[PDB]
């Protein structure tokens, strides 16, 4: 039993390398980010395109939707975020104290306090009310690639290309676990499960695996895709059947069986890099965004 995928939009727009798409937790909206200095908010459902957001003096490398689906936090090459109101397009606060790039971040489950990952090699907590950096986190000895709150917004899990995978208490600011791996491959992506009991991270081997972080035990490991270079975003697919979904560097996103580990579908379109993959939070729909040949957003439509 396989999910059937099938490609239901095109979204162009942007005018260089797409870098992150998001959907709204309501559903109704698909935030993307992109190297072009944008964010971009199509319907999730007829693909239409919204409006452009714009602000960041350099490229954005995330984005990501608070609760309540009307704020949306950024992260760009400019050194900053941005916390933006997507009704009125509006920058409410603008994050300032990383010392490069800023590559990923998140809201906490609450919509209280936001987490970005840096160039710099650190992880920013962040107060949203105030745009005040509570803690800085000395996380990392190279470039913070992914950082996720749990459900409950008490751990944060971080991932970098030193090769380490770090879980830290929110409140407290410190580490609980690190993961290690001898060969100690750079680590491009890490996100808790919906659950939180374990990490999906991805490494620039090739490799997807599933991990027991309080046991440090692997459970299971996706293969069969490429990615040696970039940070490409991977997710649970839970709507329907169990999967795991993630881009590729041969321009498929791959879709696998959690369980059993095989290639249930592998999806053609686009003409470019697979950089970032989102299910959406209630139908079996999958935005998945390319690099610089492609520029665009694809939003397919699966039965299960």
Do not use: M
Not at 103 to 113: A, G, V, Y
Not at 186 to 198: E, H, L, R
């Amino acid at each position: 039993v396989k999910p059937n995928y099938a490609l239901k939009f095109t979204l162009a727009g942007h005018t260089k390398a797409v870098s992150s798409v998001k959907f709204s937790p309501n559903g109704e909206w698909l935030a993307s980010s992109s190297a072009d200095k944008l964010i971009k908010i199509w319907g999730a459902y007829d693909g239409k395109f919204e409006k452009t957001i714009s602000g960041h003096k350099l490229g954005i490398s995330d984005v990501a939707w608070s609760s309540d689906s009307n704020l949306l936090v950024s992260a760009s090459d400019d050194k900053t975020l941005k916390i933006w109101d997507v009704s009125s397009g509006k920058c409410l606060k603008t994050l300032k104290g990383h010392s490069n790039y800023v590559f990923c971040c998140n809201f906490n489950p609450q919509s209280n306090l936001i987490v970005s990952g840096s160039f710099d090699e650190s992880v920013r907590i962040w107060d949203v009310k105030t745009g005040k950096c509570l803690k800085t986190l000395p996380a990392h000895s190279d470039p913070v690639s992914a950082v996720h709150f749990n459900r409950d917004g008490s751990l944060i899990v971080s991932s970098s290309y030193d090769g380490l995978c770090r879980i830290w208490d929110t409140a407290s600011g410190q580490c609980l676990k690190t993961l290690i791996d001898d060969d100690n491959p750079p680590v491009s992506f890490v996100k808790f499960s919906p659950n939180g009991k374990y990490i999906l991270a991805a490494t620039l081997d090739n490799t997807l695996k599933l991990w027991d972080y309080s046991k440090g035990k692997c459970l299971k490991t996706y293969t069969g895709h490429k990615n040696e270079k970039y940070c490409i975003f991977a997710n649970f697919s839970v709507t329907g059947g169990k999967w795991i979904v993630s881009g590729s560097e041969d321009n498929l996103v791959y879709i696998w069986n959690l369980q059993t580990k095989e290639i249930v579908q592998k999806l053609q379109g686009h003409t470019d890099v697979v950089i970032s993959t989102a299910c959406h939070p209630t139908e079996n729909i999958i935005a998945s965004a390319a690099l610089e040949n492609d520029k665009t957003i694809k939003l397919w439509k699966s039965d299960c």
